[PDB]
């Protein structure tokens, strides 16, 4: 997170911290008591799935207050149309071994209906992203949670404003750019999987997942987020399925 | 140059060079005020004037739903939480 401000404790409760073998891996978004949502590119370079732990209610990585909770994740689900090392189809669904206890600092974020997200939420300008990524471009990971306000742009308007990039991956129907092109604010890499929350009449909804911001705070470039409006039907079909023994299950899309 | 009955639904006209501007009441809008701003309760129009969810029926008026754990009030446009810890709401801000 570059150019943002510190999010007060309890103002960003749907964020989760994913730790593998006691190391920072990626952020995440809690949607219900059992399932958590984060990016898919975070799990390319991993082979020991037993030590994957999600931390909820954490705000300061240095201090241990009583609001912190940790649960083991027993299943990670990625769409079949995703190949590792690619930005397309960057979404992952994880099932905790045991549910979390909802407190004042831990509340889930609603997964909107596809029709509601495609018509009503997609036309709200300022949606907020949060994460524990590097506070400065290729710098040091922040100790406190950082929140950023970014504007949402369509792919058509986003493509023309882009600067001369050596490699421009295709922005499919499952992704959308959001942020500023002046290099002041952008979505970093360390905060990948963070919630791109959108507000509508006193309620907060998940509309995007940070996947790649073309590095961090790059001049003339935006932060491409994964569109969740294209996965609600796919997510819920297997979210209510039986607990298959596969830790990493390649569920067929859609 | 406004005798062709241009203003519709109680509008008032003002003369312009080859043009005709209609000064209409707030209930109508348009160049000729041919649009019924009250009679456009469709779900694509600002979510059908509803807080969380809506469902546009075929012929009759739109019906409004709510997200999981929410029940709509008697007004038909607002949703109230039912569980102790609702979704998408910060408990420290109340």
């Amino acid at each position: 997170i570059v150019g943002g401000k510190v999010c007060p404790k309890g103002e960003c409760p749907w964020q989760v911290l994913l730790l593998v073998n006691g190391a920072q891996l990626c952020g995440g978004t809690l949607i219900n008591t059992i399932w958590v949502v984060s990016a898919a590119h975070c799990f390319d370079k991993i082979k020991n799935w037993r030590n994957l732990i999600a931390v909820l209610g954490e705000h300061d990585l240095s201090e241990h207050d009583g609001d912190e909770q940790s649960r083991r994740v027993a299943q990670v689900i990625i769409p079949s149309t995703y190949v590792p090392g690619t930005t397309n189809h960057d979404i992952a669904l994880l099932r905790l071994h045991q549910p979390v206890v909802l407190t004042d600092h831990v509340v889930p974020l609603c997964l909107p209906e596809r029709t509601f997200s495609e018509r009503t939420l997609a036309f709200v300008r300022f949606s907020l992203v949060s994460g524990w990524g590097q506070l400065l471009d290729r710098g040091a990971t922040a100790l406190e949670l950082m929140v950023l306000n970014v504007p949402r742009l369509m792919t058509q308007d986003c493509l023309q404003q882009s600067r001369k990039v050596g490699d421009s991956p295709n922005i499919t129907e499952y992704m959308f750019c959001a942020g500023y092109s002046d290099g002041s604010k952008d979505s970093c890499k360390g905060d990948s999987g963070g919630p791109h929350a959108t507000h509508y009449r006193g309620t907060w909804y998940l509309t995007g997942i940070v996947s790649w911001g073309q590095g961090c705070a790059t001049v003339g470039h935006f932060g491409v987020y994964t569109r969740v409006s294209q996965y609600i039907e796919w997510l819920q079909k297997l979210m209510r399925s039986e607990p298959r023994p596969g830790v990493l299950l390649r569920a067929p899309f859609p | 140059q406004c005798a062709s009955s241009p203003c519709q639904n109680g509008g008032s006209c003002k003369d312009q060079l080859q043009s005709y501007i209609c000064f209409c009441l707030p209930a109508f809008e348009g160049r000729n005020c041919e649009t019924h701003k009250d009679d456009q309760l469709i779900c694509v129009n600002e979510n059908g004037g509803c807080e969380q969810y809506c469902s546009d029926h075929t012929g009759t008026k739109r019906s409004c739903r709510c997200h999981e754990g929410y029940s709509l009030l008697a007004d038909g446009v607002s949703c109230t939480p039912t569980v102790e810890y609702p979704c998408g709401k910060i408990p420290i801000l109340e």
Partner: antibody
Amino acid sequence: QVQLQESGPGLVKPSQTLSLTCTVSGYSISSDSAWSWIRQPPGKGLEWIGYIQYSGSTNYNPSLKSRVTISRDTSKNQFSLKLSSVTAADTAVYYCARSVNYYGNSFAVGYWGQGTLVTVSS
Amino acid sequence: EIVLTQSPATLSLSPGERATLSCRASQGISDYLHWYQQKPGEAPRLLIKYTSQPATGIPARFSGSGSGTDFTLTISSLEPEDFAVYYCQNGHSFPLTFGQGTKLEIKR
């Protein structure tokens, strides 16, 4: 193999307190579940009295929220109900049940108890 | 409170026929509706969850459809063992509400 059964007196005088105890064997109350009490009068009018999920938090039906209390003791693997000021309308068969597909906001009812009939009379 | 109405109150159909049961809701509860069967003297059984997915061990003859306000419960090839009172449960918002019940007397 998860099974549950309720234990009660079978008769409670009106203007008194109604108590019922449900015992669970194949599942742990404090892992992942919402546990509810559902009653049915002889007219078979299924009514959801209330539910208590793990960690002790409770939510009750607003129709009778002022006279119901549901508690549990994790050590004994059982959870009970306390309905006070019972009238003739409370004569019903009370079912102990477990919630299936419980993800917070709402759930279903997959596992049911055998049901115990309670008669309210003087 | 979501008031749920079940119709018809009484239905009498032969085994060779098919039975259609309706479950209207006072609001749009999406697909969050579960169906139950209660044979007399026994606890209800979860037949169909979320109006489309059948449970485990449930015979394939039972099926469901609908979303929003109106829901339907279908028994394709009725059999003599289907005599029971069927219920649909609100599964979207509290207070959790069950149906009135539709008795299904079979002919022979």
